[PDB]
């Protein structure tokens, strides 16, 4: 190790020149006023920069995940939307596997999921992309099982998604058949009400429901609407007869990317007085349960060699410290979104104060976090140490402006104490944040702003031997923090960290 490094992650501290309701600017913050000058950077922590949809604010779990990982981890929605945009379903490994199984087997494949543009559990565009790719892959026979929404979309929008689907299958692809329509109340239960699931299950396997066809099914639904039965509660409609049922040896893909409401129906298929079809293989758009044998079209990012893992692999010990409210953020999320502790990794939990709301004690336990970090700097055992400072975010969420000011003052004090100890004991200090919050405490109306923001966050560096630079093709972002730490420490960067170091050694 060339340089020992102390990384401070402030929680909810963004960079805003807009002074109204700006608890950071208006707080006495003389330490960060100095660290955020000269050689410092401002990096992105929201939206596509951290793998979230464009325009979406950051948060603690995304932010610590990206900081710790040294790469953008793409949230399911973005990841699948990119695959659609770039025509990547046709080479998706698991889709090719599902299609090869059908082509080498009985030729029959099924798609099943929530058919709307709600985007909470699914999107109709993803189902359309799947049909196009399955057609291109040469699957002989494809059936669709349409789960009516009415919850993430309006209760009488389903007939519009049904018209879109029928027209798409008939005239755009000329391939694939609608086999079932049933409300999400039945198909997508998550409360172990198996009498609800069974309605959808028997429709899919046994054709239990109202018989219809392409010419009549929209009118069936309109009659349901007129009887005050809306999308979420549609009782089953059965098309194509027995051909369209899930039968022995069939293959099925569920295209929802939200696991909680897919666990029951997918388990019923993959593991009532009807005979259960045998030798089914089930695929999910994403992982629904690690305990399931199902392949996923978009399995979890493997997240090999996040910073904590990599330091342990290089035989470098490390320290992670937070107070209670952010302890999961510097452990579970920082380490890649799982509960794993690495060889040589020491953890430190500072108790948060026992108060009804944190605006009552806005300094929370920042002083105690600083005390523990200073102790580690004095010992010098760990070449990498990091902490989180909770107050700006947690007091920010109360909406109380003057409390947020005091939170930022207490955080600045704590940062200065750590800074002075890094200079005495030979560590370089880098200060960053996981997203903004306290720089925007008031809405334009004067009312409270209790949410995260889309502002950039600081990245500071006390070592005078390096200069900040920008990436060639994009703004710097949280994915660049761990690469930059490793460069300052003189350590190698793993290939899996596709973020870049944004310093150059002088």
């Amino acid at each position: 190790v060339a340089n020992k490094v102390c990384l401070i992650v402030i929680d909810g501290w963004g960079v805003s020149e807009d002074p109204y309701g700006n608890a950071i600017l208006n707080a006495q913050t003389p330490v960060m006023d100095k660290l955020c000058s000269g050689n410092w950077a401002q990096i992105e922590a929201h939206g596509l920069h951290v793998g979230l949809p464009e325009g979406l604010m950051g948060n603690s779990e995304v932010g610590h995940l990206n900081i710790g990982a040294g790469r953008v981890i793409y949230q399911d929605i973005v990841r699948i939307n990119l695959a659609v945009k770039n025509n990547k379903f046709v080479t998706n490994e698991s889709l090719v596997d599902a299609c090869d199984r059908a082509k080498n087997g009985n030729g029959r494949l099924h798609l099943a999921g929530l058919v709307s543009d709600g985007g909470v559990h699914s999107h109709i565009d993803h189902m359309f992309a799947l049909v196009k790719a399955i057609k291109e892959l040469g699957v002989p026979e494809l059936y669709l099982h349409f789960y009516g929404d009415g919850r993430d979309t309006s209760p009488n929008s389903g007939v519009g998604f049904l018209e879109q689907t029928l027209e798409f299958l008939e005239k755009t692809t000329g391939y694939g058949k609608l086999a079932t329509v049933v409300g999400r109340y039945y198909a997508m239960d998550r409360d172990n009400r198996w009498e609800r699931i069974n309605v959808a299950y028997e429709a899919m396997i046994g054709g239990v429901g109202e018989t219809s066809d392409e010419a009549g099914v929209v009118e069936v639904v309109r009659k349901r609407y007129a009887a005050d039965e809306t999308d979420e509660f549609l009782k089953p409609i059965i098309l194509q007869g027995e051909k369209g049922r899930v039968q022995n040896d069939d293959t099925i893909i569920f295209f929802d990317y939200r696991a909680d409401r897919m666990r029951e129906i997918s388990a019923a298929m993959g593991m009532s007085k009807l005979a259960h079809p045998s030798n089914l293989q089930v695929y999910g758009m994403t992982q629904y349960k690690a305990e399931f044998p199902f392949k996923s079209l978009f399995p979890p990012a493997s997240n090999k060699n996040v910073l904590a893992e990599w330091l342990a692999e290089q035989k470098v010990s490390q320290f992670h410290c937070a107070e209670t409210e952010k302890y999961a953020h510097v452990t579970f999320f920082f380490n890649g979104g799982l509960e794993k502790q690495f060889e040589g990794e020491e953890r430190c939990l500072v108790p948060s104060p026992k108060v009804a709301t944190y605006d009552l004690q806005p300094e929370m336990s920042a002083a105690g976090v600083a005390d523990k970090m200073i102790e580690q700097l004095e010992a010098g055992t760990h070449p990498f140490i990091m902490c989180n400072f909770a107050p700006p975010d947690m007091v920010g969420h109360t909406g109380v402006y003057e409390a947020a000011v005091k939170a930022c003052e207490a955080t600045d004090i704590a940062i200065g104490r750590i800074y002075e100890a890094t200079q005495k004991h030979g560590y370089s200090l880098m200060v960053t944040a996981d997203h903004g919050n306290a720089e925007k405490m008031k809405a334009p109306d004067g009312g409270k702003h209790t949410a995260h923001t889309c502002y950039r966050v600081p990245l500071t560096l006390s070592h005078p031997g390096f200069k900040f630079v920008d990436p060639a093709d994009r703004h710097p972002a949280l994915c660049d923090v761990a690469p930059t730490v490793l460069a300052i420490m003189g350590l190698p960067q793993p290939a899996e960290m596709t973020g870049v170091s944004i310093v150059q050694k002088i």
Partner: peptide, 13 residues
């Protein structure tokens, strides 16, 4: 919360 990038990461805390 079950895997990095699942739906709970859209809002977090």
């Amino acid at each position: 919360x079950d895997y990095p990038g699942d739906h709970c990461y859209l809002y977090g805390t």
